Design a protein around this ligand. Structure first.
Ligand SMILES: Nc1ccn([C@H]2C[C@H](O)[C@@H](COP(=O)(O)OP(=O)(O)OP(=O)(O)O)O2)c(=O)n1
Ligand SMILES: [Mg+2]
Ligand SMILES: [Zn+2]
Lengths: 208, 118, 179, 873
DNA sequence: TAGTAACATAGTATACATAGGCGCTCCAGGC
């Protein structure tokens, strides 16, 4: 979302929860990466668990959510005593931490551990001083703007059984950007004024 | 309490005697193996040596870079519990940058906490 | 010569590219997001010509730069990627050779899956996510309709090296130790 | 936000695994600008757990289990909780205070009245074990109480009622699909203000059609219909017409193209029907329409069993967007489908209440089968035509067939709505929920244990007690204790006059009379001792009194004359429902898995019932009167007279003499029989005398327990038995009766041999207790064999609770009669099948007639066999 | 370090089932 930050599982577990935001002291973390050894893995019908270890604290559990239909990477479970790099975001549940695995990669060059530890120390120092410095009625409320009104009228006017697509919408309206088209379409679909017919790019009004 | 449940600091051959009765990981350049197989010698890349002993003689042929997990004994020797051989088929490993990494880590241990720090 | 190693936070703080000439610097980062929409377009098949051709709904495409009509076209890679490092993130745009190096497959190869195997195309995009490289980026600031928008152009991507990178990191941490 | 905020809640929901300590409320709110009601959602946070710690009298060390001779106090308990438990189980913030409570339940070694320690803390902290023990405390209560129950019993909310919120807030982001949202900080601000009339709701009734494709073995949706009413009153009469708007949508499954000029025909007929391209378009249109209409009650047939699961599965497979619009809560991960008994389906439609007519029909009335055709035939008086699944594909050739299919679907939806309005389900459900206090969607779901549990919970909470904590954790089983008593009958035929006497609400009156309650009766199979007759009424007697007094007013309304028959039927159904609720409240005391299990409490009631029946029988026999029958609360008297006024006077005298003794118990005349035919226990037939006065009275047939009311005999045998028993009770000479019976039997035999009877009068109906695949001995079970064949052949996926019909065919394979059962469609379609006449003449008519005619001289089994011509020798 | 386009940029796991009582006949099949 914003920036990945290398860290260590010791810092991960020592982090605290404040208003859905995990802070290790005065350091905010949302996505993290860690490099370590897998000691034991357990196979679930859908998920796969791993026992990562960075020799800084007790071994940690990492959960990788894989769909059992895609029999591509689950059959390639990494054998033990292998050093791998894990990128993902952590999760908290009943005062025991957990890790969600966005990506798992076996490590080929083995100077990467020292590079990773240097990243950890340097980033921790830099961002710790970066936070260390100071100065851091109930109505339905309806109403549509003119742009959304034009979009709705354009959607309504078409006689095609499958409805309009994005190309025609962009062609007819040259007075506003594509992003405005996307926002108006999203809002109209959320309010139920339009619905998709076949694909996500086809739309049609519901009243007609 | 098995050793894999406790923190193991990375200590080179420089400060072997300062971590007595403490878990420790060591890595480096294999030099010589005793014919018995219970113990061997290791190089830290700085010209210094460190000896490792095992309760049972080693059964497999070892070579290349190796790391050992153990504890410093009264004789400043390492009682190994596990070891892993490091790959050298593709990329060389430069131990000097590793050593300076240990020096830097010891320089600022606060940002690399050992154990659970409250 | 030597790459002007600069964190993106420093790049946005000093206002790189606000001068009359663009500024050049390179950095290592990891890809966090890519856009698969509008990524493919038809370029002019004439040699050393890359103007976007216009379909005439007849199987023959006429190029305005060469004023010439051809029955075939060549695919050309255009991509927008979200680069991100430990501190900040940036939006960059690639070209044929750089995106082809990043993805690892030539454009004509991709010309088949988008027509016959969408799943394989999605898989190819997927397996290249969360990779780290060294990108040379040139920054310049152009104004369009009275707002200044910073744009990033990348002309070279390379695999990450560890020796000199580690030496530079050690040098920087030593330097910050005094400060 | 402006001071107060009034709204009327309908449904509640909570999630203790993702958003602990929050409770959602959905309902209606009045808007002055538009002069209408709109949907609203209010979400409540900060619900704290409550624990009660029981101090000891002497300090016992755990390791040794001995007393150290040290007195105890509240300070010691506080110190032990703070120092040991809080640090061990990671509890940071808490509030503690001593209180007084009363306990009168199963847990032993607890004083009736004592001082407890009340501890409250936020729900996000871990949960203590259910069996905690300490140095100074011996027990704890309320460790695993849910948040919804805590909120409901703390705020004294009893069903739907008007609520007010003090100092609301505004959410940063939308959560629900409601028009207006609100936020409450603490459950202290919510107050009950119910003193006014409820607002109207919006009702939607719907039904769809399905077809099975040959290539892909899945069920597709090809047509839908829906009817909407906008101002459905909740407490008044059902509006007429019951619908105000409607819509229909049709689509082609995957390949077949619509017949040519279909759109032109639709325009010509000016029908508001929407054509779609693929299934995804239909699903999207349906979701958009339900979101736009915003219904509050969705009514359909077999919703929970088949329709909802198919709809959700097709939504998942077709990858349609915005599946959560079917409910009211924004969710993206759909719950696991099928799962346990209706858990996933109920969770999928959160915020919207589902009304299935099948469950309501099962609860309220009694039928031989519960498919839509039978319900239409019985509740209404109309015929519904059934379209086989096979022909559906063929109807895709001409536009007229498609229009007929759409009209049939619309008619099906209209029939469902008419049945729901006729049965008067919504007012009854609302009244029951307001009486009990649970969530009324669960009331619509069914079941009798939850209502009683919630009623007792409310009654005990209101009276400053402590309730037991929740337990962690097919066919009728073996009996556990003695039940009622049935007197020895006096078999035969009676002609002079029969009188019937009966008690009113025997078991509630027993409970109210003898002051039987959890608190009062002291429990150490042995029947306990009666309570001391100087105490006060317990909670159970008062609740039973309220429930039994709620019925006398309905009976008084019934007694009024000049009423339309439908209103009489509705009142009768309501009174029967109230009686069943009271009886269920009694019977829950014997449920093994119940929260208030207590066996002696019911054994005492049954023992007193038997004793009272004995005493009444002896007292009646003392007056030189002959007693012939009685069934655990009633007495039959043979007056041996003809004058009616004498019988009335004798009954009045007996009633006056009996009522003179007891305090609350009462007796009454339940009927006067002109002639009675008694066969066995709980098996008789009689003519009930209805006094119309004015010098005349009308006699009506009545049967009890015979093989004429059972659902597992063929219609031919039932008709023959009804005719014979009608002839027997008539006033004629015996010889004429014998001759008429013989002539009727000879005609029946000749007609059956000739094969002139319709096919329909041969079916046998049975029901399945379990799933068809769970019977190891399917070889000899016909209603399992036919069910398995139906399941394996096509669709409709017959399951537990359904009814299966079958007939016996002649396959020419010299097998037993029980292994040659076939469905009626198989008999009609296949050519090598015919109705087995000998089996039907030997095992269906002969036993019934023989059993009915047993106590009549001149007719015997061998004569019956000879009359049918069934090879006499 | 020409040539490229158009104009801002995205959340996803899970975990938790309900069900009033007993008394008195019927049938199918093997022993
Ligand atoms: N579904 C039922 C019906 C009856 N009973 C038991 C409890 C009753 O006390 C007893 C007598 O039932 P009656 O049918 O004779 O009904 P009541 O005497 O309670 O009421 P009413 O005055 O309507 O006859 O049978 C029961 O447990 N469950
Ligand atoms: Mg009764
Ligand atoms: Zn050109």
């Amino acid at each position: 979302a914003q920036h990945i930050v290398p860290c260590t599982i010791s810092q991960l577990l020592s982090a605290t929860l404040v208003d859905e935001v995990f802070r290790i002291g005065n350091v905010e973390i949302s996505q993290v990466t860690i490099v370590g050894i897998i000691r034991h893995a357990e196979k679930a019908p859908t998920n796969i668990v791993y026992k990562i270890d960075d020799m800084t604290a007790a071994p940690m559990d990492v959960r990788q959510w894989v769909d059992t239909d895609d029999t591509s990477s689950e059959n390639t479970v990494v054998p033990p005593e292998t050093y791998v790099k894990v990128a993902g975001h952590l999760r908290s549940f009943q005062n025991k931490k957990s890790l969600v695995a966005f990506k798992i990669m076996p490590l080929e060059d083995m100077n990467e551990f020292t590079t990773h530890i240097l990243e950890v120390i340097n980033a921790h120092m830099v961002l710790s001083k970066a936070n260390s410095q100071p100065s851091a009625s109930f109505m339905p409320a309806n109403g549509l703007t003119v742009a959304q009104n034009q979009v709705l009228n354009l959607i309504k006017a078409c006689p095609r059984p499958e409805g309009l697509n994005f190309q025609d919408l962009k062609n007819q309206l040259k007075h506003m950007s594509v992003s405005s088209i996307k926002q108006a379409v999203d809002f109209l679909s959320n309010e139920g004024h339009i619905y998709s017919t076949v694909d996500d790019d086809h739309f049609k009004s519901t009243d007609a | 309490v098995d050793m894999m449940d406790l923190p193991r600091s990375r200590i080179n051959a420089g400060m072997l005697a300062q971590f007595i009765d403490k878990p420790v990981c060591f890595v480096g350049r294999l030099e010589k193996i005793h014919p018995t197989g219970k113990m061997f010698i290791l190089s830290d890349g700085e010209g210094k040596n460190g000896t490792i002993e095992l309760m049972e003689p080693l059964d497999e042929e070892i070579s290349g870079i190796v790391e050992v997990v153990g504890r410093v004994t009264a004789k400043a020797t390492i009682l190994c519990t596990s070891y892993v051989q490091f790959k050298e088929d593709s990329h060389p490993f430069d131990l000097g940058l590793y050593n300076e990494a240990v020096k830097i880590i010891h320089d600022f241990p606060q940002f690399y906490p050992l154990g659970i720090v409250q | 010569s030597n790459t002007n190693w600069k964190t993106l936070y420093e790049v946005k703080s000093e206002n790189l590219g606000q001068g009359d000439k663009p500024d050049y610097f390179s950095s290592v980062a990891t890809v966090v997001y890519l856009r698969k929409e509008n990524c493919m377009y038809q370029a002019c098949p004439t040699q050393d010509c890359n103007k976007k051709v216009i379909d005439q709904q007849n199987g023959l495409y006429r190029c305005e730069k060469c004023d010439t009509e051809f029955p075939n076209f060549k695919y050309r890679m255009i991509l927008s990627v979200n680069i991100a490092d430990f501190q900040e993130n940036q939006w960059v745009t690639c070209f044929q050779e750089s995106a082809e190096a990043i993805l690892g497959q030539n454009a004509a190869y991709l010309g088949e899956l988008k027509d016959k195997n969408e799943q394989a195309f999605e898989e190819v995009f997927q397996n290249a996510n969360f990779r780290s490289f060294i990108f040379r980026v040139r920054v310049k600031v152009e104004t369009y309709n009275d707002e200044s928008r910073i744009k990033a152009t990348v002309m070279d991507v390379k695999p990450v090296d560890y020796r000199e990178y580690g030496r530079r990191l050690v040098m920087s941490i030593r330097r910050s130790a005094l400060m | 936000e402006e001071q107060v905020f009034h709204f009327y809640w309908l449904d509640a929901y909570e999630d203790q695994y993702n958003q602990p300590g929050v409770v959602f409320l959905f309902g209606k709110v009045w808007i002055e600008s538009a002069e209408t009601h709109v949907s609203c959602c209010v979400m409540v946070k900060n619900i704290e757990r409550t624990l009660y710690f029981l101090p000891r009298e002497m300090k016992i060390d755990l390791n040794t289990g001995k007393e150290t001779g040290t007195p105890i106090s509240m300070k010691d308990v506080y110190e032990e909780f703070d120092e040991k438990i809080a640090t061990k189980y990671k509890i940071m913030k808490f509030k503690s205070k001593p209180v007084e409570k009363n306990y009168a339940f199963e847990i032993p070694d607890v004083p009736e009245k004592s001082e407890y320690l009340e501890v409250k803390y936020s729900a996000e902290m871990p949960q203590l074990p259910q069996d905690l023990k300490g140095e100074t405390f011996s027990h704890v209560f309320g460790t695993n109480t849910s948040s919804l129950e805590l909120f409901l019993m703390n705020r004294k909310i009893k069903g739907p009622c008007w609520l007010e919120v003090k100092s609301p807030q505004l959410l940063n982001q939308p959560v629900s699909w409601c028009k207006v949202e609100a936020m409450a900080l603490k459950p202290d601000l919510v107050n009950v203000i119910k003193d006014v009339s409820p607002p109207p709701l919006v009702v939607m009734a719907f039904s769809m059609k399905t077809m099975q494709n040959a290539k892909n073995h899945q069920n597709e949706i090809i047509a839908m219909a829906a009817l909407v009413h906008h101002s459905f009153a909740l407490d008044k009469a059902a509006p007429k017409p019951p619908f105000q708007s409607h819509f229909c949508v049709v689509s082609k499954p995957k390949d077949c193209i619509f017949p040519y000029a279909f759109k032109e025909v639709i325009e010509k007929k000016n029908v508001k029907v929407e054509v779609a391209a693929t299934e995804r378009t239909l699903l999207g249109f349906f979701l958009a329409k339900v979101h736009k209409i915003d219904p509050d009650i969705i009514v359909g047939h077999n919703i929970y069993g088949f329709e909802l699961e198919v709809l959700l599965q097709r939504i998942n497979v077709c990858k349609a967007p915005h599946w959560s619009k079917i409910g009211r809560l924004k969710r993206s991960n759909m719950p696991k489908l099928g799962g346990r008994s209706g858990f996933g389906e109920r969770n999928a439609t959160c915020g919207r209440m589902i009304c299935d007519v099948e469950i309501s029909a099962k609860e309220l009335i009694r039928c031989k089968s519960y498919h839509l055709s039978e319900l239409v035939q019985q509740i209404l008086k109309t015929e519904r035509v059934v379209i086989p699944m096979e022909n559906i594909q063929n109807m895709y050739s001409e536009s007229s067939q498609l229009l007929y299919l759409l009209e049939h679907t619309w008619k099906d939806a209209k029939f469902i709505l008419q049945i729901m309005c006729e049965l008067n389900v919504l007012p009854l459900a609302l009244q029951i929920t307001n009486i009990a206090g649970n969530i009324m969607s669960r009331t619509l779901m069914g079941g009798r244990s939850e209502r009683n549990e919630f009623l007792l919970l409310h009654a005990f909470y209101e009276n400053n007690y402590i309730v037991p904590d929740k337990q962690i954790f097919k066919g009728r089983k073996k009996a556990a204790y003695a039940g009622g008593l049935v007197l020895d009958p006096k078999v035969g035929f009676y002609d002079k006059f029969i009188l019937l006497l009966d008690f009113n609400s025997l078991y509630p009156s027993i409970i109210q009379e003898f002051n039987i309650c959890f608190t009062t009766v002291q429990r150490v199979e042995q029947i306990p001792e009666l309570p001391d007759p100087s105490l006060e009424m317990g909670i159970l007697p008062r609740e039973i009194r309220k429930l039994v007094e709620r019925r006398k007013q309905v009976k008084q309304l019934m007694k009024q004359q000049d009423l339309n028959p439908d209103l009489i039927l509705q009142y009768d159904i309501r009174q029967k429902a109230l009686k069943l609720t009271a009886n269920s409240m009694y019977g829950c005391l014997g449920f093994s898995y119940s929260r208030f299990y207590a066996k002696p409490l019911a054994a005492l009631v049954t023992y007193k019932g038997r004793e009272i029946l004995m005493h009444t029988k002896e007292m009646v026999q003392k007056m030189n009167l002959e007693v012939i029958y009685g069934d655990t609360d009633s007495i039959m008297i043979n007056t041996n007279s003809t004058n009616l006024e004498e019988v009335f006077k004798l009954g009045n005298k007996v009633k006056s003499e009996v009522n003179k003794l007891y305090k609350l118990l009462e007796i009454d005349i339940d009927g006067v029989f002109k002639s009675l035919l008694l066969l066995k226990k709980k098996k008789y037939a009689a003519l009930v005398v209805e006094p119309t006065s004015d010098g005349n009275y009308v006699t009506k047939q009545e049967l009890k327990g015979l093989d004429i009311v059972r659902r597992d005999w063929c219609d031919l045998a039932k008709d023959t038995g009804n005719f014979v028993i009608g002839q027997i009770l008539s006033d004629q000479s015996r010889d004429t009766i014998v001759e008429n019976i013989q002539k009727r039997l000879i005609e029946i035999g000749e007609n059956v041999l000739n094969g002139s009877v319709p096919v329909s009068q041969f079916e046998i109906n049975k029901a399945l207790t379990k799933d068809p695949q769970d019977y190891p001995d399917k070889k000899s079970l016909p209603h399992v064999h036919v069910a398995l064949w139906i399941n394996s052949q096509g669709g409709r996926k017959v399951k537990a609770g359904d009814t299966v019909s079958y007939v016996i065919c002649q396959d020419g394979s010299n097998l037993t009669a029980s292994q040659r059962a076939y469905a009626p469609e198989q008999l009609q379609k296949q050519d090598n099948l015919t109705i087995d006449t000998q089996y039907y003449l030997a095992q269906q008519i002969h036993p019934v007639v023989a059993r009915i005619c047993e106590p009549i001289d001149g007719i015997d089994a061998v004569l019956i066999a000879t009359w049918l011509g069934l090879d006499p020798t």
